[PDB]
Amino acid sequence: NQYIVARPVYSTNAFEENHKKTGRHHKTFLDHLKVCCSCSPQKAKRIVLSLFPIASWLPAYRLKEWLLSDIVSGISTGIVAVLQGLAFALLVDIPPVYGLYASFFPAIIYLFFGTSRHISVGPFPILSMMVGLAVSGAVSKAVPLLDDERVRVAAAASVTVLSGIIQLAFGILRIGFVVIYLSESLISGFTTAAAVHVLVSQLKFIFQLTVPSHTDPVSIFKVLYSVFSQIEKTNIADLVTALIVLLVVSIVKEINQRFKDKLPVPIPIEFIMTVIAAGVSYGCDFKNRFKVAVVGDMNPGFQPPITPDVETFQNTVGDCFGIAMVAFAVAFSVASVYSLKYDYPLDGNQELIALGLGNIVCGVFRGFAGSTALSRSAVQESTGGKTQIAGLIGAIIVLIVVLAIGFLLAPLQKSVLAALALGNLKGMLMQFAEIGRLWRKDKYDCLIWIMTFIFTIVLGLGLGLAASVAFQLLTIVFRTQFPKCSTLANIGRTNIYKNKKDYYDMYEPEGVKIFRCPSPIYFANIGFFRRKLIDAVGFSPLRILRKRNKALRKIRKLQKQGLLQVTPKGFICTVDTIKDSDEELDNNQIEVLDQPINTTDLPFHIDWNDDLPLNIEVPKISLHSLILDFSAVSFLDVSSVRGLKSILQEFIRIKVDVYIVGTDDDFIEKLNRYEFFDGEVKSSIFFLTIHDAVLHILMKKDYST
Amino acid sequence: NQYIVARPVYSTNAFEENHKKTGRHHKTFLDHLKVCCSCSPQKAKRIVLSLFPIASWLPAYRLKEWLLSDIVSGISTGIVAVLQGLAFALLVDIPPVYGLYASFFPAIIYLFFGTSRHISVGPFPILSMMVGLAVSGAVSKAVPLDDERVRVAAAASVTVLSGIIQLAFGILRIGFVVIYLSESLISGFTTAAAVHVLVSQLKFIFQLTVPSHTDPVSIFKVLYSVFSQIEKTNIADLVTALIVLLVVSIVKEINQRFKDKLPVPIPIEFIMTVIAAGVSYGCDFKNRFKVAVVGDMNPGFQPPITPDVETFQNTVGDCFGIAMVAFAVAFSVASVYSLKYDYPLDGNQELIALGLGNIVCGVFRGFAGSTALSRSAVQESTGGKTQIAGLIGAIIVLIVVLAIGFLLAPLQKSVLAALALGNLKGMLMQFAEIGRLWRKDKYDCLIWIMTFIFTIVLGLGLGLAASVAFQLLTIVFRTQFPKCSTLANIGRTNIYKNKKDYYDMYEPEGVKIFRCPSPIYFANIGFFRRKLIDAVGFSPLRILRKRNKALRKIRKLQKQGLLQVTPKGFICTVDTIKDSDEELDNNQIEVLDQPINTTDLPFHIDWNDDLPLNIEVPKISLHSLILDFSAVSFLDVSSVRGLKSILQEFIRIKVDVYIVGTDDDFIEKLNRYEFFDGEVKSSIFFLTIHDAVLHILMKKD
């Protein structure tokens, strides 16, 4: 092996002159508008196909293969959807038939505009908890037992309509990259805290204890106190049944996960023992014997459309924004997880449009918001659902439940539904090991996890997400707040430059300091970079310039006094001692000290490093070349270019050449936008790499010698 | 000027083996604990000096030179402090006397605990509006002359809580909270607050009874209330306010245009107030035209009041915002002056001093503020060497409170409103920043405009928080969509530049060089993933899946026996097989994504050459990928996992992956993330791009 290079020393300006730069037309906003507003027949066709995916992928569906698997997967996910939807309608404290409506409508709309195929559309526990809290707040704020239920369902429908409108608006405005804002740690923490919330919520149904609806913040602890205060009145039969169902569900889930290939289809434990619980409650009359709580009979058929409440809109637009954001985030996470496995593209904007239409249609017919449940999506995908048509079948099953089947689920205990919810909550609760894992791996991400969990427990599910998101954005500033700035040195008498303190027998060229900041320089870390540069060089450039200026003022005062005329080669002082006091100039004149040095009047060049006459002392500097390795510096802003230009002006004014190395051409173009370059600070300071600058310095000094 | 290098090709691992390292451990927490528990006596002395700066910098006072300047600056600043305190007491809608305590107490405490020397401690319009809004919210939320009493009680409690918060942050040794605010956000917030203060002074120029309005949209409500009563305004008050504003602006322009000519800046504010008071007292303006007057003020300080806990609960967040704004403005001004005069300034002790000042002021029935830019500018312009100027301003305010308060009785409130409007000019002039930042950098212009919109639409306290959140969001915007590029060799040398940028790039066959000029994290890893696949021209995971499917098919044919394995190549007696699709179930699809293992086959199989029995796999020319990670600064767990997935897929499709330009600390951190594995070894890292290219060339040759 041998690395042999023999080429001329290049600066970026010299690089442009030596090699021809191609003429690349720069796209402008008007040019973009030309493409956007072209309205080509092919472009219009592709746009209308994009907005209506079902027409695109309907003939592509394979009847021979996908149909059989889709039929079974749809049936399984439909049964799961019915049971779940009853459970969340319990969580929202509205009759379960509205949970059935929420299971029905969003999926049947999403079929038409659905990019993904393996997700099941409907409510999930976190979203249903947020909807319940939002309607509780709405009924609290609004100003003038069946009437209370009617008011609750009206508020839920209005909240769902508003969330659907927000999702549709974001989808039309082509903003689907909002998913990227939430990091993995934040989602993990929020999901774990929401699982704790849902467990605490289901406790009241497990013990069959009456608990008033508590709004955020600290709602979880309020519910905990309300339940534990009445722990004596706990219905023993409900607790026993819920515990039994939860135990067998957990064990069954463990069996399914352990034997994935051996087991043909996942065992429908939830449905099986929902049937068992309903039968044992109806036959033995648990409602009268042990006074258990049951969902009771539900009115068949969908409700007529309801006009959205404008008042609820004004009161809960804030909750609706969070509901829509969480719904889209969870749906897109699940859809991406399945797409990467099955290799089919997705449009985030189309996902937003589809979910917005689903929520709008659902809320118009009195159903709460719902996007996608990870558990139900897993059931549909593992069962073998190739296409979104399977979801259709699930919705049909929900319809079959709403019309004529609904009377079967009348004698079903609510504690059973709580147990089914806890069975799914177990997987979310298992994520507590992430604290230790991330603590070993990345401190900032573990901090994000812990802070998100604390915020979501202490605050609500809605405010918790916003605080966590704001906090996570802050950790980005935390990472680059204090960059480990290093001073580099040459080793092996070659172009390799490495951290000065790491290796032995490093060679540092005399009068040359190489400084590297491995972080983007913006408002957060410009002051730290300035302080670290001064620490690395060993002297303050501005202080050196000010002392030099004060010394020059003293010499000029000496010449204007006529006591000591300037020698042709130096300063000839007739008096043995200057005996000159400090000037102590006023405030207004202080800025004069900062002005650059001019030696045009002096007939001879004066170097500050050599000794000065008249007992004048200015700190000496051995630095005559400063290289800034800006390879790792990604971007700059105004607060960065201002500070950087001030630092470069201060260094140049004391005759210390500055070379910035490692930057690409787009960086120099952007720096040209900021009006960074001027007469004093030219573009010749931008060199190609560190060794090019070092060789330039050595050649310049060799010519000087 | 010839660049000549002749060294062996170096890999990071071979670099470590070849070159000795220094056993310098960076840090260990036990060492920090030992340092904290050292309790050195010189360390104790330095800590006492840090907590009590006045003892440190008082014997160092230059009585020979600084004394006269401090006296003159203190007097000229104290007069302005009295006027501004009277005006800001009206901004808060409490009696005008309570504004003087703000000028008195915090300056006195900052004398003892203050690091900076040039700033003048006291209220400023931006914080006075915030305190007024806080007390309005507090009196509204609180459950059941008296109105004035409850207003001043709420103001004192809010100030005490803000001082407690500032002191707590100071003890916690966190003073770098200022860096989270940028030049752009502060500019927009200050100009929007100047608009707020102008709208507030409108209600006093016209002398209209406008009720206290809380946020949000607290500025349009005042505009509607004022313009609704536009007929009721007094002509005399309006004309007086306009006259004082005009003369103040003209003299301000004279003072700025002639700085050297004027030895001391003209005290236009004091002269204008003196003339207004004299003309009002002489001509009996209050009885004649029913103009507003300050009136009788009770001499002396009020007895201390115990802070109301209820007010603490009601306005804790607004107190948090008040403290943040006060410290940010104070540190900005103090740093501006310290950089000019070259003296060390401690951020934490600034917080401690301002917190103590706010606490002391709030105990004695007075709202408090950090410092005014206009008053600090006056103090420095006249020339104040040492905080003894602040002390002298404090004594001036004291003698105003005790003896000569009665002089400021027949003063028009519209006059003080015009006085504030005079100083608002500096912040109102900042509207050209929109046009400048539009062409300079559009993200900063967006920060400016969004901060202005938030602060106008919402309150000051909530507007600042929303502006900070959007400020961080713009940081995410900058690196959201990096301009990922592909590089190529130019001039047969080690220089590598954008392929599209120049003419006649030589790109070595089967080598792709990819550069992402941004840190890679959660908001960036997906875009980097998509751009890499776009640049190479083929999806690595899709290639691996197709290869796995084809090779499963040939194993199926082999176990059938139709084709026989031969070292030279695949040999089939019959080539009449019909193509079939396995169509694996959902559970088994993951099997496709497993590292191709051909050890069973007796002959190596290469995917680029044609495959027998009509089996097609997308051929890839690329055989070595270089990732120029010089620009990449940091990675989180979300980006590291994605990067490992991409590298694992590329290695699984039998293409080499190198990562060049990284520092030693980068690899050390990557070791912590458990990124390295028996597959993704540490040998992939190389020093520069050309070392990797030379290694590839030697490997292929």
UniProtKB/Swiss-Prot annotation, chain A:
Tissue and organ distribution: Expressed in the colon. Expression is significantly decreased in adenomas (polyps) and adenocarcinomas of the colon.
SUPFAM superfamilies, A to Z: SpoIIaa-like
Organism: Homo sapiens (Human)
A Pfam family it matches: Sulfate_transp
Post-translational modifications: N-glycosylation is required for efficient cell surface expression, and protection from proteolytic degradation.
Predominant cellular place of this UniProt entry's protein: membrane
InterPro entries found in the cross-reference section: S04_transporter_CS, SLC26A/SulP_dom, SLC26A/SulP_fam, STAS_dom, STAS_dom_sf
Biological processes per GO annotation: cellular response to cAMP; chloride transmembrane transport; intracellular pH elevation; membrane hyperpolarization; monoatomic anion transport; monoatomic ion transport; sperm capacitation; sulfate transmembrane transport
STAS domain ranges (all copies): 502-697
Similarity section: Belongs to the SLC26A/SulP transporter (TC 2.A.53) family.
Regulation: Inhibited by acidic pH.
Name of the protein in question: Chloride anion exchanger
Function: Mediates chloride-bicarbonate exchange with a chloride bicarbonate stoichiometry of 2:1 in the intestinal epithelia. Plays a role in the chloride and bicarbonate homeostasis during sperm epididymal maturation and capacitation.
Cytoplasmic face of the membrane: 1-70, 115-118, 174, 256-319, 373-388, 468-678
Transmembrane annotation, as ranges: 71-91, 94-114, 119-139, 153-173, 175-195, 235-255, 320-340, 352-372, 389-409, 447-467
Subunit structure: Interacts with CFTR, SLC26A6 and NHERF1. Interacts with PDZK1. Interacts (via PDZ-binding motif) with NHERF4 (via the third PDZ domain); interaction leads to decreased expression of SLC26A3 on the cell membrane resulting in its reduced exchanger activity.
Topology of this chain in the membrane: Multi-pass membrane protein
Associated pathology: Diarrhea 1, secretory chloride, congenital: A disease characterized by voluminous watery stools containing an excess of chloride. The children with this disease are often premature.
Catalysis performed (reactions): hydrogencarbonate(in) + 2 chloride(out) = hydrogencarbonate(out) + 2 chloride(in)
Keywords carried by this UniProt record: Antiport, Cell membrane, Chloride, Disease variant, Glycoprotein, Membrane, Transmembrane, Transmembrane helix, Transport
Subcellular locations according to the entry: Apical cell membrane; Membrane; Cell membrane
One cellular-component annotation, GO: brush border membrane
Stretches of the chain found on the membrane's Extracellular side: 92-93, 196-234, 341-351, 410-446
Keyword check for Repeat: no
Entry GO MF terms: bicarbonate transmembrane transporter activity; chloride transmembrane transporter activity; chloride:bicarbonate antiporter activity; oxalate transmembrane transporter activity; secondary active sulfate transmembrane transporter activity; solute:inorganic anion antiporter activity; sulfate transmembrane transporter activity
